[PDB]
Amino acid sequence: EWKFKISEVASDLEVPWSIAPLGGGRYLVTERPGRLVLISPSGKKLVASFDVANVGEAGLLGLALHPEFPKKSWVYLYASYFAEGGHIRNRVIRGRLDGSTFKLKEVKTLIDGIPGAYIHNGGRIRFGPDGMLYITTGDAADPRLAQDLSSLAGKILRVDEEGRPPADNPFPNSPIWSYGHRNPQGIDWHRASGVMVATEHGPVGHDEVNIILKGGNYGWPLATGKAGRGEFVDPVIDTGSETWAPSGASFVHGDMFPGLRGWLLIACLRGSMLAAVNFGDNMEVRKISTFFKNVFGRLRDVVIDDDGGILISTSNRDGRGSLRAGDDKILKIVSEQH
Ligand SMILES: O=C(O)c1cc(C(=O)O)c2c(n1)C(=O)C(=O)c1cc(C(=O)O)[nH]c1-2
Numbered sequence: 001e002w003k004f005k006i007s008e009v010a011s012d013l014e015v016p017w018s019i020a021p022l023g024g025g026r027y028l029v030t031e032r033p034g035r036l037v038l039i040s041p042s043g044k045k046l047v048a049s050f051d052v053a054n055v056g057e058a059g060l061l062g063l064a065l066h067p068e069f070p071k072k073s074w075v076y077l078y079a080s081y082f083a084e085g086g087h088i089r090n091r092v093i094r095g096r097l098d099g100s101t102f103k104l105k106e107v108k109t110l111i112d113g114i115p116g117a118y119i120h121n122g123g124r125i126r127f128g129p130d131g132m133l134y135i136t137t138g139d140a141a142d143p144r145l146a147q148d149l150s151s152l153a154g155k156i157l158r159v160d161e162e163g164r165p166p167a168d169n170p171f172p173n174s175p176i177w178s179y180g181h182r183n184p185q186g187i188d189w190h191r192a193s194g195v196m197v198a199t200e201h202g203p204v205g206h207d208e209v210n211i212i213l214k215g216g217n218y219g220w221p222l223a224t225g226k227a228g229r230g231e232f233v234d235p236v237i238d239t240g241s242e243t244w245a246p247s248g249a250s251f252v253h254g255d256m257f258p259g260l261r262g263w264l265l266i267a268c269l270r271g272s273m274l275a276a277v278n279f280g281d282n283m284e285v286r287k288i289s290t291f292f293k294n295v296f297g298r299l300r301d302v303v304i305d306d307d308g309g310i311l312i313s314t315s316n317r318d319g320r321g322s323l324r325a326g327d328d329k330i331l332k333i334v335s336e337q338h
Pocket residue numbers: 057119120183201202203204205243245269270271318320
């Protein structure tokens with residue numbers, strides 16, 4: 001049996017989309033309606049507000065700190081907005097966070113006009129081992145765009161700290177890294193092998209975990225789940241007729257849980273659970289375990305804290321689920337002797 005203690009790190013957030021650990025029990029969090037909050041042991045502080053398209057699954061979403069933070073004080077956000085004609089689109093922005101009087105300054109757009117909708121806006125952003133910013137996007141309710149290399153929809157993007165496609169991107173002067181995605185909301189890198197992983201929502205069933213290769217085509221909408229065809233990279237997990245609704249995902253690392261080292265943690269929305277996936281040598285699926293089924297309701301993000309503790313966000317305030325007192329929250333999971 002797995003043994004642990006869970007505390008509430010913060011509460012009554014509105015759809016806390018993304019958590020970025022600062023160390024010393026401080027955290028930056030986005031709330032989907034358009035705000036970036038600092039969480040401290042002390043209390044809750046509003047860093048920045050944003051006028052976002054706060055409708056359906058759109059709003060203020062991913063959050064990433066520059067790999068050199070706080071020395072290079074750059075903070076990246078992924079945000080929905082109403083474009084010309086009232087259509088929902090998505091952008092990636094960046095500001096300098098003042099390490100004192102925590103305030104955000106010189107916010108500029110890096111990437112504009114990503115397609116968007118009430119559904120399928122992607123949204124997860126994270127720096128990988130190569131120092132590049134990766135960005136997930138959904139098919140914006142328009143599945144064919146996922147196969148279209150002239151479109152930013154249904155992709156995983158990879159750009160530098162400035163939003164530029166690196167010369168070694170797979171496609172000519174293009175931010176695209178991989179394609180054929182429906183609605184990916186989770187990415188991480190295995191801390192030893194550097195293998196990249198991503199989650200995805202499937203059409204009802206067929207939620208996925210994928211190993212992300214440079215220039216890979218993940219099949220949507222020509223294929224869903226394990227299709228067994230040469231032209232599409234298949235998922236390593238395919239939930240079949242079951243629905244997880246996975247978003248955020250992180251590989252476990254650090255001192256806290258040595259026996260979970262290199263397992264993949266996945267927050268599930270409708271699944272209302274934390275999935276844990278054990279990868280063998282050469283990234284074969286050894287085991288999948290399932291935690292907290294229906295105790296907290298909908299879960300959205302999962303990240304490892306500076307000490308190796310597991311941070312989770314709840315998402316019952318999107319009202320696709322029912323509320324617990326003081327939802328939504330950030331929960332921290334530590335080992336028993338802590
Ligand atoms: O089949 C389902 O029941 C189901 C549930 C959910 C959910 O729990 O919100 C999503 C999806 N599907 C889905 O396809 C999807 O792209 C999605 C995005 C989100 C989100 O909250 O950002 N939820 C869901």
